[PDB]
């Protein structure tokens, strides 16, 4: 397609699963991806020579996130790999990085809740803060949401929780960037299979009957971030096979 | 792109504006795109020839909609073209015929409310009744709506009123068809300027400040008719530059 | 409670169900109330005795829906019952009226379409439209809508667009009539016992596990309607028992 | 009215503005009303003497938001109050305590950020919670969030998202918590004035062109909280007068 021909992309938690087919499908239309991770250098080493071994261009970037300096470390590695290259602007950031909390609200921790929203809501916010100032213009903000934020899920409350907070910033920052032709936009993954009765019940909760893979929502947010969706904005974007529809 | 290789379209109000647009950039990417009108005949053959011109494949299809036997007719002149030719199956159906009423509640008519009830509303559900019999697996059912579903427009009512009925229809379908692997979607245009103070609200009513293009809506509605968009389905997408976003 | 002290209803469909349980309630807080019917007039009479027998005041009102001039009849049959009385003047507006069309879209006719438009939409559109010159400043218009509107529900899909339809409805004249202190909302009942795998798929479709009752619903319009609803206004009410939540 | 007669209320940020009417309109109606507050000891028992004064039940209860140990703070005071006296269940959970931060995205410090999401979403949260060892069937729990999770309000956008969160535990709840007739609801306010081109454009954001009173958000709060709304659950009630309708 070559739809990001001459973008910067930042791709946080890009290394694998949903993260790792995004930062592989924007490499693959040109964009180049700066692959995020907070724990797993491997992976991201991983992902960055699978790219470049397609005849794409992407770089590492780590920065644990959740931990006091994390975006700002973020955007300090992003700046040392562009430095003295392509320019400290970038056209397309995408909030993929997140972790689970399978827990319903009898057994939810302060640790674990602490920690879901620090991943979840505090990095990305912080990290989005600071895109602003590099943001070009018609630019691309998507975050990578939850089914669970639209569709009640008790068992997983405070990790949809994180997310639903992440959403509220979607339609605020679509509606102060417009005037600059950047697009604001959440994609909501539903029940992916990435790298008993659970996997039977979220497979069939997709009106076609599976689980999503990550490729289903990379094709999403592939568009999400190109020219053609220009005039979309502020939109929760379904990425589930029609999760929740009827009943 | 040639996302729709060897795939049938029929794309309803086909011949201008947004019909027009959506039939050119289906053509464009392979699609064999059959353009209906009601009235205009002429500008059918333009927009026919235009894609001709351009190397794709398109036809005419007459059907007068809001009149009886109106349904019957269209798919009675899309299988006369199709035959001893494509066989009588299609891919993708855009129900974007529509007329506009722009009066408040105080000035609507009966006349001028069944005319638009009949165009907008009964016609498009007939046409897809009669849809469901020659859809492929795989298949596309997008239909044209308007932002006024979403966003209180008391000025045009009752045609929002139409378009309202037929968002019901998306997510009924979708869940219909989905073990199919058919997705169905709503694509909702803003305000749009096609071939003195209303201009003005209706500009800064995006977020953007500007009016929509027909091509703004056609590259959504051709990423929708996509493979890439196969994990989309029962959605209302926002085509309106992030009108109602804000106050 | 006599929240209602004063005031005239008009509750079309009022003889029955749903329609009953919402003029029984509207008339214990001291509303005058207009009962509506099309057909059944002993059901009518019934209600109204009822009433009269509990020492709310209530008449008859006998106007078919879905017939040329029904809307002009339902009005000049309430100010033939007010003339020589309370003034020409109402404060609370419930489109009630309803007839069902449970076909899917592969079985609903051209009649059963046409038939259930006439009564669930263009009736209630043309009533709401003549109700604007009588309705007096903190009115109420309150439209009975289903759960089937937000909720895909393939087998009555005909019958949710007709009352998707008038879902537009409430947001525009929501805006339109904002100055005047008037609320428009929607009350969404989901499936209601009134006077065999459906009936356990309905009832267990509540996060209550049983099916609705018309109290149930009459209980949530009669607030709609009071002064205490004074600040909601345009709002899709969910009176479903929870309807569509989980999955 | 007596609709809450023999129940027992819990309003965080019971003491002033909005928490305040809430209590008041609860304790009005029988409900027992401990009133919470975190700084202002002497506006809670301000609060407290008024409903006394007027022939209710109240009693202060103390307990510092977004600390380390608030939630447990809380239960152990409401725990102390009730004990040798009203045992140790509620009927209705209500979470107004909330702080600000008008503050766009570019200005918002880590302190400022973390403090919001202390006191706005984990304080409830972990308060929530631990009330659903207490919590009674056919009891109430009540979310107070804002307009602007729904409308975007660039410059209050950390605050919207601290009650984002919140929006998604109601419906999380309403699921689990509904086989025992317990309803979960969030009540959004607008702008209210509670005790210079800011004030024109929330006022004018209402389509009844003024600003709420803490009486309109009672009012519909005391109605969520009643047996009348035992049918409404899940769901985000707007009490804003119509704000963000139009455009």
Not at 87 to 90: E, F, H, K, S, V
């Given at each position: 397609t070559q739809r990001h021909q001459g973008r910067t992309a930042l791709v946080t938690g890009?290394?694998?699963?949903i993260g790792r087919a995004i930062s592989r499908r924007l490499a693959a239309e040109g964009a180049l991806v700066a692959v995020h991770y907070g724990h797993d250098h491997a992976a991201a080493e991983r992902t960055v020579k699978e790219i470049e071994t397609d005849g794409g261009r992407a770089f590492p970037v780590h920065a644990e996130l959740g931990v006091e300096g994390d975006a700002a470390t973020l955007w300090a590695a992003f700046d040392e790999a562009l430095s003295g290259t392509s320019?400290?602007?970038?056209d397309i950031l995408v909030n993929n990085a997140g972790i689970t909390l399978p827990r319903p609200i009898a057994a939810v921790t302060e640790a674990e809740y602490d920690r879901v929203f620090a991943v979840n809501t505090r990095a990305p916010f912080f990290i989005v803060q600071r895109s602003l100032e590099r943001l070009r213009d018609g630019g691309r903000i998507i975050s990578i949401s939850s089914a669970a934020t639209q569709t009640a899920?008790?068992?997983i409350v405070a990790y949809s929780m994180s997310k639903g907070a992440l959403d509220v910033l979607t339609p605020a920052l679509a509606k102060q960037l417009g005037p600059r032709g950047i697009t604001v936009n959440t994609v909501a993954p539903g029940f992916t299979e990435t790298e008993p009765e659970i996997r039977k019940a979220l497979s069939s909760a997709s009106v076609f009957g599976r689980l999503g893979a990550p490729a289903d929502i990379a094709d999403v947010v592939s568009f999400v971030a190109?020219?053609?969706?220009?005039?979309?904005?502020?939109q929760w974007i379904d990425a589930t096979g029609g999760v929740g529809l009827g009943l």
């Open positions: 890009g290394s694998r699963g320019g400290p602007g970038l899920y008790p068992a190109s020219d053609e969706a220009r005039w979309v904005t502020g």
